[PDB]
């Protein structure tokens, strides 16, 4: 209902960042829940036809032994950011001879994202990232916007119908939630407003523990869906 | 495998295209400003997945 | 000040005035040229002011050797008393701090002469409204609350689209004096209608043709169909000839 | 009316298939005074005209020396003329200093055209705004060449460039059938007569507004100025 | 602020003074003296033509001058013949901006127009401003073109200006004023390829000498030719930009 | 990067106008300490009680700052401040003066308004700290690169009324931490209904030759607002 | 394409690049040139207009010699054509130096077409405004004919025409049986077509330029002798 | 038949339809805001005279230097913006001193001219970095020296090229000064006559009164070196008038 | 000036219209391509049009050989497609030089997509208006079909189509794949899909067919006689 050629919106924010957020809000839903021991990440991987090959590309990607992430927005930007995140983690490990903390990696990725909001002749990234990690026996969960502003959460959702997902999470969250219950709650949140039949091939689930981060095999996803 | 080999195999156009792409991407450059990361330059140069 | 070409000015009671606006692309001026050339109006006087840059030339609508040597100025008035129509044409540009006085003087003349209604042809930038521009028609209309109810009913029957408001005030970027004219007509209670189009600078003959067809859908100055006489002065719109020893 | 959007940059094509900046640059040649060049079976002659102002304020170098067998005359922008003259001098000097042999005039002109074509295609640059007449002698004999801001060059029997050179061109076309058999004196007389056509009906050639450059067989390029043009000026008839 | 705008407006005013007394006239110039003929020249070449071929005979007395300031501005002096006080002559050698043209018209002409007054205007334009189907450089410049009002009984000595070509600025302002207020007038245009002080450009105005307006003001040609030839030898020094 | 015909910087003016729509921050200097008070515009129950847009950052053990503007630019500037302080400490074996740190950041902020083709930072700062040269201090900054010392100031939304009330109810050399906190609560309530969960309070002081920076708890904020309510009820 | 036609890095709403289209339109204000591939060679023909009588005969040539065995005919901007000819010469020389044998016409056409296409992607340069054809002959390869346009597309042809009147020339060429003829008849056919598609009133007097490369020349590009040109011109004039 | 706006004076690489460079023309026009300078070269030497205008009695006249000494045999006079000529003067001094220090000869006036002109044409260079000069210099110069070819005089304008001359005047009153010089200069005149004529023309064109404090004068001779007149010499010469 | 004239400017709804226009530019060619993967083979079939009778038909093709074991079919602008093919060959050579073994199909497709992504985030260069489909055989995975687009998005398929009539081709292929292939059945399926979608009876000189097989892992282009034999067998 309004198009602006200026830099700052009348509400006091950057116009291009608002447009990038509008682009992000039209993507596939994503859900992240932090439990007492571990973090669970989930996303919707609905495909347009049976002609596709689900074993080709993945939306949940691991950065290192203990860090993984998921996105909601434009695929190519996520692909170009994942490689930079992995390179930064490897550089930190080479320099300091120790695994990078989650907060440092989030800070560096956010700085890289912010760099593109000030220069001329470029455009900001159109993605929002959810990052999970494990440090000193304590799970972490972060969310970053296209402008590079990050906050730490306990349960959050983005993409389509994220307000209803946030309401659902607020209504059905507990401080002493277990990993299995967290996975069940995340799958239920994804099932809410799915407009279809959920199988073990059209969703992706990843978990983080004290043993590291890994992506669930579709057999395990089918087993989890059997309980529901 | 370098610019001379590419010119001898394909022609004069390939190194010219590569250098024009490099110059167009490198326009984000200034001395009195803060440190910068050359994401697009590393992607085009092909060294975005290796550590020097 | 209206200066008649003859001795005494004619009467314009119950007449409708067609007016252009100096906007982006000169679409209104080109449409006025098309209308005057096709409908074959005759000069009746001049609108002498001090707000437009002076210019002079011969007859732009010459059709024979006899009338091809008539001088013309930057603001002239034509009329067709058979169908109660009067037209104004501007062939120049405005000087600084001289648009509002021109609008005030023109509306004073419109009130004093006894005209019935005013129609303004204008244009606006084609890259500044919304994503709705790319998936909708490029024609918009505006109306004054003083307009007759029959006109409103006819416009609603024609299935047109009204110009969107801006947060509520009317904003027409690249429209020239059309916003000032609309505001002053609303203040002075004068029936005014505005028809515009989203364009870009370049070759704008199809834009003028589309605008005159859009106007004809309502006024029906020609036969109702999907035709227009091109003036003889549309000759060298891109310049002179090509120099030799290049191609 | 519609030319506003397409006549500001050299890298923008018009919808008619034209580039207006090249034509505008070619229009800058007529801002200088006129020059005349002609050749015979054994000689090549350049004749130039100096500005009508006083000589105290400025001394003008209209005819320049490039090599022992090449000389040029200029009309247009002084900076562009200086750049082109330096380029030609460097090319000729390199050829001699390395290979111990003179540089062919056709090769030099081709190099000039190739160099001048470049700025007509890049962004943020403008075409050269100077015109050249080149006279030289080599194994193939005398030569007269003309260069254009549009990076085009021509081979001529006689040519005139500058301001109001159409009358000189008409005279050269009318009298071109007898240049081959003329000797040096008659060739210079023909050049002066052609150059005189660009002046008002009352003015006449004078030793203070005429420059002459001559190259030919067994004669290196030489520039005659001031009192040196008196032998050539003597013998001319009334208009 | 409004103060800077007011200062700028006051800095660009037009004043009609009298250099004999250095006092500005409080009444329009034409409202003080009767007029029957009025000749106006704009530019270097037209001023030189009038000063060489017309103002070399009789006694001409100055009655006023105009003062103005632009980023491009040079004088504007008015004369009238002593033997015939009803014949006026103006020589504008400066540039009048678009916001000063109507001030100039008001100062010179006023709000009260009168009939029985012929007006002739002379000016020059570059040949590149001409529009033609063929190339610009193939035209035999310089040439002469004319525009007239609707009550000019006489005929021009040159072909009328072709259609897609238009004229603006001060000559257009004067012609528009004359056309609106029903005053006979004519404008002469010289399209030339040399816009500086040139002998051929000045001599391009010769056919106008045989018209009825200038019939009684030209006495002898050779003296005018000698004066013009002497005058052409005092031109300003040019820059080192061209060669 | 372009001078207006009247001699003004449109980009800087736009940045300041945009900052004028941000949250409200407060700073009051007392005889024995200095405090910062901010407004929490956004809040959710699901935040992780850390990195929850904590507007009071800690640069060193002696200094702290508050931000009203773009969060990412604020993060960049704070990170740069931390590196500057650490580098100076490593070089000189001595903590950096607060004014020197502010000047170092202001030089970077000013360079962007003169060089290159990048937009300036749309962030305003508020620094509090202690050093042996001058003791307790309080500074301010703006996108143009200007800075100055104050005794009580406010930035953000409705800052003019807060400044007017501060200048009306502020007395030099007679106020302590408790009076400063009460005045800050009154000003924030007037400029914002206020809830104890919508504000953040931080204080700086000295404890046996050691700078101590603390953030007030929800219970303490509730106690303070209850005392203010009791006082305003007793007044009427 | 108003609003999307000021740069070569912009797409039209219907998926078009208008700067390249304007560059291709810039070829239509140049004199027409044709080329016909025959059983044992290729013949070129150019309609050349005379500018003035002060120019020496043989100047402003539009039929170049790229190498010992390659002929070239251009149309459009002359300076762009000369630069492209220099590029082609450099490529042929490099291939000769490296691989030790003459470059096939297909590879040369591909290299030059890619070089031309490289100028239609960025906003720092402008597309070329010329078109040209290449011809060659060999004992083990036969006759070859190619075309390159400003967009950067190259194809092989049996008969080609570029310039202002390419449509009428192509219509005239379509009526020929060049697959079974010889060069001695193709020269006359080319002269007749050039004389037919010429406009006498709009354009002034012209001169005819002809060339071939083929078996009777032993794989060399040369100029037609004067007697053959005179006979072909007489035949064309008497037929027209 | 419509009047529209069109501008061609926005950049330095744009040609007008008649083939002109309006930015360079404006840079040249900027010289009209400077003071008047006069330079005359004869068979015995070169004479330079300049006018310095003091805008307030509180200003110090000694703080205005419009005639400088490049070397022992070269002098210069400025007109326009004095701040722009500093780089050119420094470049000329460095070139001359370096050449002497390296080879033990003296550069020619033409060589110093070329060295200076290389820097003044930095705008419009093929590969000039954006951090260097991007606009024409707003100053005009008048070089005068004695070489083995005899006395020489050169003139430079914001265009960027030097031109040799015999008697040139620059500044606001350049037209009147040149008109006066035209009827005075001749080939057989001497240095004292040149000094007297230049002082007479300066007095004629100056709005103030010639009082040997608001002017400067210098001469270069083949025998002696660059010499600048003092107050006593200026008064002695002026009292002749 | 405008949200659709800039490649590096988002629209209020978060869209990049230059990429959409580049997608629209693919249909300018007017041709359709179909790729079908079998049990142990991959088949690509394209449509050939040679309207001019003065044009040498041997010089018109859309099937390319990137590597001795990798094939390709291009849809869209001809010059852009040829430039893309040259870039793919250069990238394959560089990968082989750097890593000592031949590049896989998925890695080549990923590299091409990564290169294409940069053109969408910088304003001084424009995307290429072409679509690339690659086929090959992996050492431990079998036949593979991959596809690119101007936006920088890539994925693996069992069957896909590009150009005009892509929606109809996908609708036709969906039912066949759901219903549920030997070497003869894959070629027959692809040819039948193209013929039914185009509503034209094909001739041996009107199409191009390229295949790859597990037994013979080298890319091969079928001849007119083989295409005619396949057409006779189908009919």
XYZ file of N, CA and C in Angstrom, chain G residues 2-4 8-17 37 106 114 117 120-123 146 151-159 170 173-174 178, chain I residues 4-5 7 18 20-22 24-25 28 52-62 77-80 82-83 86 123-129:
210
model
N 10.702 1.889 -23.312
C 11.037 3.102 -22.579
C 11.192 2.797 -21.094
N 12.251 3.333 -20.490
C 12.549 3.093 -19.096
C 13.437 1.899 -18.828
N 13.724 1.081 -19.845
C 14.573 -0.094 -19.692
C 15.613 -0.191 -20.804
N 23.012 -1.883 -21.071
C 23.040 -3.247 -21.578
C 22.947 -4.290 -20.473
N 22.826 -3.865 -19.216
C 22.680 -4.771 -18.084
C 21.264 -4.761 -17.518
N 20.286 -4.330 -18.309
C 18.904 -4.213 -17.870
C 18.013 -5.088 -18.739
N 17.056 -5.758 -18.104
C 16.090 -6.601 -18.793
C 14.752 -5.881 -18.903
N 14.114 -6.021 -20.056
C 12.773 -5.508 -20.269
C 11.755 -6.394 -19.555
N 10.571 -5.860 -19.241
C 9.546 -6.691 -18.587
C 9.161 -7.935 -19.370
N 9.312 -7.936 -20.692
C 9.051 -9.119 -21.500
C 10.315 -9.921 -21.790
N 11.443 -9.552 -21.189
C 12.665 -10.318 -21.331
C 13.483 -9.970 -22.557
N 13.741 -8.681 -22.766
C 14.505 -8.215 -23.911
C 15.571 -7.232 -23.454
N 16.650 -7.156 -24.225
C 17.702 -6.166 -24.030
C 17.656 -5.232 -25.231
N 27.883 -18.655 -51.400
C 28.757 -19.818 -51.412
C 28.414 -20.702 -52.601
N 35.522 -22.386 -38.666
C 34.564 -22.552 -37.576
C 35.124 -22.020 -36.261
N 32.376 -14.931 -29.757
C 32.435 -14.830 -28.302
C 33.017 -13.491 -27.864
N 30.238 -11.035 -28.231
C 29.221 -11.218 -27.198
C 29.690 -10.711 -25.841
N 28.189 -7.305 -24.402
C 26.752 -7.109 -24.252
C 26.258 -7.439 -22.847
N 27.158 -7.508 -21.864
C 26.794 -7.919 -20.517
C 27.000 -6.856 -19.450
N 27.843 -5.856 -19.690
C 28.224 -4.897 -18.666
C 27.767 -3.497 -19.049
N 27.662 -2.640 -18.037
C 27.265 -1.251 -18.225
C 28.452 -0.315 -18.407
N 30.166 -17.775 -43.256
C 29.667 -17.544 -41.908
C 29.211 -16.099 -41.763
N 24.701 -9.129 -31.752
C 24.331 -9.866 -30.546
C 25.390 -10.899 -30.182
N 26.034 -11.498 -31.180
C 27.085 -12.464 -30.929
C 26.729 -13.873 -31.356
N 25.908 -13.996 -32.395
C 25.430 -15.284 -32.885
C 26.061 -15.545 -34.245
N 26.622 -16.740 -34.418
C 27.286 -17.126 -35.656
C 26.648 -18.386 -36.225
N 26.445 -18.393 -37.541
C 25.839 -19.517 -38.239
C 26.513 -19.693 -39.592
N 26.352 -20.883 -40.162
C 26.822 -21.173 -41.503
C 25.705 -21.006 -42.516
N 26.064 -20.534 -43.708
C 25.074 -20.143 -44.701
C 25.453 -20.678 -46.075
N 24.447 -20.754 -46.944
C 24.641 -20.966 -48.373
C 24.581 -19.670 -49.166
N 23.894 -18.662 -48.640
C 23.818 -17.348 -49.245
C 23.398 -16.325 -48.212
N 18.000 -11.040 -50.034
C 17.761 -12.430 -49.658
C 16.675 -13.055 -50.522
N 18.291 -13.848 -53.779
C 19.220 -14.969 -53.658
C 18.469 -16.292 -53.575
N 17.294 -16.299 -52.940
C 16.549 -17.542 -52.762
C 16.158 -18.193 -54.084
N 22.720 -22.159 -56.472
C 24.162 -22.020 -56.297
C 24.859 -23.333 -55.967
N 11.984 -1.935 -9.822
C 12.105 -2.944 -10.864
C 13.203 -2.646 -11.873
N 13.768 -1.440 -11.861
C 14.899 -1.108 -12.716
C 16.241 -1.400 -12.061
N 18.634 -4.219 -9.971
C 18.788 -5.620 -9.595
C 19.027 -5.757 -8.095
N 14.119 -8.173 -11.790
C 15.090 -8.424 -12.849
C 15.327 -9.918 -13.038
N 13.079 -12.227 -12.442
C 11.874 -12.718 -13.103
C 11.897 -12.405 -14.595
N 12.399 -11.226 -14.961
C 12.522 -10.884 -16.376
C 13.554 -11.767 -17.068
N 14.642 -12.100 -16.370
C 15.612 -13.042 -16.920
C 14.981 -14.411 -17.138
N 11.806 -14.860 -17.813
C 10.951 -14.680 -18.982
C 11.752 -14.708 -20.277
N 13.008 -14.257 -20.233
C 13.841 -14.230 -21.431
C 14.146 -15.623 -21.973
N 12.065 -16.724 -25.080
C 12.256 -16.025 -26.348
C 12.701 -16.971 -27.457
N 14.921 -21.242 -42.252
C 15.548 -20.683 -43.443
C 16.118 -21.789 -44.322
N 15.864 -21.693 -45.628
C 16.422 -22.638 -46.585
C 17.824 -22.259 -47.039
N 18.281 -21.049 -46.727
C 19.632 -20.610 -47.047
C 20.611 -20.851 -45.908
N 20.172 -21.496 -44.832
C 20.990 -21.711 -43.647
C 21.492 -23.147 -43.620
N 22.776 -23.316 -43.318
C 23.367 -24.644 -43.198
C 22.873 -25.296 -41.913
N 22.080 -26.360 -42.048
C 21.462 -26.988 -40.886
C 22.464 -27.739 -40.021
N 23.649 -28.051 -40.549
C 24.648 -28.762 -39.761
C 25.258 -27.891 -38.672
N 25.081 -26.575 -38.746
C 25.653 -25.648 -37.781
C 24.678 -25.255 -36.680
N 23.474 -25.819 -36.670
C 22.458 -25.506 -35.670
C 22.339 -26.697 -34.732
N 22.587 -26.464 -33.446
C 22.494 -27.523 -32.452
C 22.313 -26.899 -31.077
N 21.829 -27.718 -30.143
C 21.691 -27.316 -28.753
C 22.234 -28.354 -27.782
N 18.712 -18.000 -24.804
C 19.495 -17.234 -25.762
C 20.719 -18.026 -26.210
N 20.995 -17.982 -27.516
C 22.044 -18.820 -28.092
C 23.431 -18.385 -27.626
N 23.721 -17.084 -27.706
C 25.034 -16.594 -27.303
C 25.267 -16.804 -25.813
N 24.241 -16.553 -24.996
C 24.354 -16.795 -23.563
C 24.595 -18.271 -23.275
N 26.048 -20.491 -25.265
C 27.410 -20.842 -25.661
C 28.433 -20.326 -24.653
N 28.241 -19.100 -24.159
C 29.128 -18.572 -23.127
C 29.067 -19.423 -21.864
N 31.057 -22.616 -22.411
C 32.493 -22.369 -22.308
C 32.925 -22.216 -20.852
N 25.114 -4.585 -9.129
C 24.344 -3.771 -10.060
C 25.043 -3.516 -11.389
N 26.315 -3.879 -11.523
C 27.076 -3.562 -12.725
C 27.055 -4.676 -13.763
N 26.321 -5.758 -13.518
C 26.291 -6.884 -14.437
C 24.926 -7.553 -14.356
N 24.558 -8.239 -15.437
C 23.220 -8.792 -15.545
C 23.259 -10.314 -15.628
N 22.202 -10.988 -15.183
C 22.154 -12.449 -15.289
C 22.014 -12.907 -16.733
N 22.396 -14.160 -16.960
C 22.280 -14.785 -18.268
C 20.897 -15.400 -18.432
N 20.288 -15.168 -19.591
C 18.962 -15.686 -19.859
C 18.962 -17.059 -20.498
